Scaffold this active site. Structure first.
Site: not given
Ligand code: HEM
Ligand SMILES: Cc1cc(N)nc(C#CCN2CCN(C)CC2)c1
Ligand code: HEM
Ligand SMILES: Cc1cc(N)nc(C#CCN2CCN(C)CC2)c1
Ligand SMILES: C[C@H](O)[C@H](O)[C@H]1CNc2nc(N)[nH]c(=O)c2N1
Ligand SMILES: C[C@H](O)[C@H](O)[C@H]1CNc2nc(N)[nH]c(=O)c2N1
Ligand SMILES: [Zn+2]
Lengths: 419, 414
Positions: B110, B282, B287, B113
């Site tokens: 992520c 958000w 994405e 963070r």
């Molecule tokens: C607040 C703004 C946030 C932004 C801008 C953001 C951004 C991103 C992006 C661009 C990805 C990759 C998504 C993909 O390529 O499929 C990602 C993955 C992820 N995000 Fe964040 N995120 C945010 C908030 C959060 C929050 C609130 C959580 C959990 C409480 C979180 C947990 C995760 C996790 C666990 C992944 C890995 C998902 C996977 O392996 O499929 N994110 N995030």
């Molecule tokens: C909280 C949050 C914010 C953000 N900007 N993007 C994501 C995402 C995603 C993409 N999903 C992640 C989970 N995986 C099982 C499938 C693909 C999540």
């Protein structure tokens, strides 16, 4: 005893057994992955300087075994004799000498094994120049001029490697001090800006300090700085008629030519080390042809390189107030369009990142089908622009280290004791 | 022991000690790297649970500067009694909040963070039915959406017990578009959601059969059969995609939803498993504009956009795909910003992540990061993360993948 990799676009699954033959550490463990570390591991196959017999002979035997296996012998008369020959050679000189066939086989397999190279579908079409009779920096210059002329081939580029004498005791190294046979100088300006290529500022200062008279331009081809048999290095000017260059213009933007950008046609890495059967070839320049993004994305648009995004975006009349207009992304595409269009216009071999990555997927399938695997470094294989619209982005890859190989080595100015 | 990472653009070097605290596998070995493998390779016993719980409680009391305190020791006491007598235990609200935030902090894939400590945690551990889950999720959506001024939030449903009574949201995200395979081989809507769309229809959903149908919620409580619910349309914020220069772009009919809300992952805190834990933040523009719109197996709009751009599509080296990709991503960002819906572009987001990384190394001793996922899917090396060495390791609490529910659920009806 089996590891699968999946392509998430096609759902093709491949099964890897080649990794069972991997020789040295990646740097990763069960608990930590070092996949984005540029130099994660110092694991080398032989120590220090001249190895003892029990240090060198095992590595030689492994390579000779592999070569004779590759040609459907192994245990043959010639294999067993070769082993005994290498044994006596090590007994009586602390080293051994590769046969021409072994040298060619080793060089091609070092390229075939280079997990960071997207161009390896070509690996068996490699011209090998044996330069192991070289004794002086003048001779190295002659060998390098011939390499450059053969490889350039008036724009119809041909892959080649020139192999100078292997390391012996570590104080008689052959080295090309240049990082590539052909690069541009960088100059630190009095105000504090940089003219030319910032990455080459230090190497440029060494050349100047060795007597080079710099023109002090933006695209000054550097001299060769060649070290033979451990002596002090010597400067040589590559004959400019051997240095093919491409002026960069754009198919739509008439003003692009007025930026005065150019690049050279021949990418020729000269600072790496070629390891075959425990032998270390510290001077082994190799060359192929460019993928456009190497110039258009990295060379031109890295912040610490020619850093031209601001200038191109200006002439494009883009909004540069905020990152979210994506003005950098838009200029970046146009620059790479121009690079490709210019090379192609001048009939200089080049490949775009779509064609190259597609070829690499085909290469991977070929390698899994015949060899049972293909070591591949996703971090290096995926191009530095438009990643997910190329097929390799969606391809899982396994990375492991096979020998023969190309290895990094320290810059010789950090180690050389001047005479 | 220390490990160094280097930024090759700035030459800044950072020293990682936090990796010494990991004890879960990456998938790599000493001789093979599986860093590009998406998924490298069930109820804990009492004996397994004790040390996991201790480690979590220890780290919680350390974080609040009361390690070794009487409160710390009585909590460990209390937790061990619960495991001994019930084979599980219950988190205090404070530990639940701490655990949820730290699973985010620890999510190596992520890039967002820098926001980890500003997370609204909705405790839904008293829920017992799918109707209750729908209510909790509606309130999450409303709070998180906040009329476009998006706020990060997570809602945590009851933890796994015997594995036969799991709470699950069957949706992969709370808001996604349906996909319908046509008789002629084509696909309407989102191809990624075809299978889940079929499951919904089978459960009784009447589909509108459009290109952007918001899917119903398919909610499973206490291991019972899942039940369908329609999210109230006024809680679903969407953005019509238009372009600041190309007036024809709006005619493509494209739109997306404002709230990214992942609902199929598992939250692990102190050995406890929260199988239903939807969380939302958000969007980063790429994405939607790179993956959702331009993946060949998703909406796959590159061809149509490049046609309208009058690009030469006969050769790849014209970079027509690259050219159209950028314009699509400009449109996405312009559309969200015009409608005052929170979004972040990949340049801003990656810059923030670098500053977050530096800070984490300073105050925590490191920051596990998955380069393969952190680097955006376009314009890679013009973002700072491309040039940043990163170390990837697994810290707990964590977010984990889990099997799709329809592959493991044993149906109870008739
Ligand atoms: C607040 C703004 C946030 C932004 C801008 C953001 C951004 C991103 C992006 C661009 C990805 C990759 C998504 C993909 O390529 O499929 C990602 C993955 C992820 N995000 Fe964040 N995120 C945010 C908030 C959060 C929050 C609130 C959580 C959990 C409480 C979180 C947990 C995760 C996790 C666990 C992944 C890995 C998902 C996977 O392996 O499929 N994110 N995030
Ligand atoms: C909280 C949050 C914010 C953000 N900007 N993007 C994501 C995402 C995603 C993409 N999903 C992640 C989970 N995986 C099982 C499938 C693909 C999540
Ligand atoms: C023939 C056309 C070739 C193409 C299109 C090609 C393409 C590439 C590219 C794009 C890179 C990444 C460069 C960077 O980002 O710094 C690379 C790396 C590399 N290539 Fe190739 N290559 C070709 C030929 C060769 C040959 C002939 C050899 C050796 C005999 C070779 C060996 C390597 C090695 C060892 C690396 C890794 C360099 C490093 O780790 O710094 N390549 N190649
Ligand atoms: C043979 C070849 C063909 C091609 N298209 N690119 C390259 C390269 C490079 C860039 N170097 C790689 C070696 N590293 C030490 C510094 C950066 C090499
Ligand atoms: C930190 C990171 O490993 C480093 O910036 C790498 C990333 N991937 C790369 N990929 C290629 N082809 N060339 C490079 O120089 C790099 N640099
Ligand atoms: C095979 C490879 O690991 C896979 O395509 C990954 C690459 N990097 C990614 N990065 C992000 N952010 N999201 C993804 O889905 C992927 N997919
Ligand atoms: Zn690894």
């Amino acid at each position: 005893r089996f590891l699968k990799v999946k392509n998430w676009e096609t759902e093709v699954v491949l099964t890897d057994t080649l990794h069972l033959k991997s020789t040295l550490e990646t740097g990763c463990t069960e608990y930590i992955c070092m996949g984005s570390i540029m130099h994660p591991s110092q694991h080398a196959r032989r120590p220090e300087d001249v190895a003892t017999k029990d240090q060198l002979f095992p590595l030689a035997k492994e390579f000779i075994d592999q070569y004779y296996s590759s040609i459907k012998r192994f245990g043959s008369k010639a294999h067993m004799e070769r082993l005994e020959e290498v044994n006596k050679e090590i007994d009586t000189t602390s080293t051994y000498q590769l046969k021409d066939t072994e040298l060619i086989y080793g060089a091609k397999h070092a390229w075939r094994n280079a997990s960071r190279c997207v161009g390896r579908i070509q690996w068996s079409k490699l011209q090998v120049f044996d330069a192991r009779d070289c004794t002086t920096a003048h001779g190295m210059f002659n060998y390098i001029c011939n390499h450059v002329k053969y490889a350039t081939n008036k724009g119809n580029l041909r892959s080649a490697i020139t192999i100078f004498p292997q390391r012996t005791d570590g104080k008689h190294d052959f080295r090309v001090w240049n990082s590539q046979l052909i690069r541009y100088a960088g100059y630190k300006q009095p105000d504090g800006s940089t003219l030319g290529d910032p990455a080459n500022v230090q190497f440029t200062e060494i050349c100047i300090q060795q007597g080079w008279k710099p023109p002090r331009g933006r695209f000054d081809v550097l001299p060769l700085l060649l070290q033979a048999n451990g002596n002090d290095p010597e400067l040589f000017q590559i004959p400019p008629e051997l240095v093919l260059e491409v002026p960069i213009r754009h198919p739509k933007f008439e003003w692009f030519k007025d930026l005065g950008l150019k690049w050279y046609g021949l990418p020729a890495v000269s600072n790496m080390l070629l390891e075959i059967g425990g032998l270390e070839f510290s001077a082994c320049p190799f060359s192929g042809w460019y993928m456009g993004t190497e110039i258009g994305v990295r060379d031109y648009c890295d912040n610490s390189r020619y850093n031209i995004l601001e200038e191109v975006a200006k002439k494009m009349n883009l909004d540069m107030r905020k990152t979210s207009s994506l003005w950098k992304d838009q200029a970046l595409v146009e620059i790479n369009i121009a690079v490709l269009y210019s090379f192609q216009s001048d009939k200089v071999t080049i490949v775009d990142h779509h064609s190259a990555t597609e070829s690499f997927i085909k290469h991977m399938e070929n390698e899994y089908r015949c060899r049972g695997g293909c070591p591949a470094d996703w971090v290096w294989i995926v191009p530095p622009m438009s990643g997910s619209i190329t097929p390799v982005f969606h391809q899982e890859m396994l990375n492991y280290r096979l020998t023969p190989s190309f290895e990094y080595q320290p810059d010789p100015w950090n180690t050389h004791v001047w005479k």
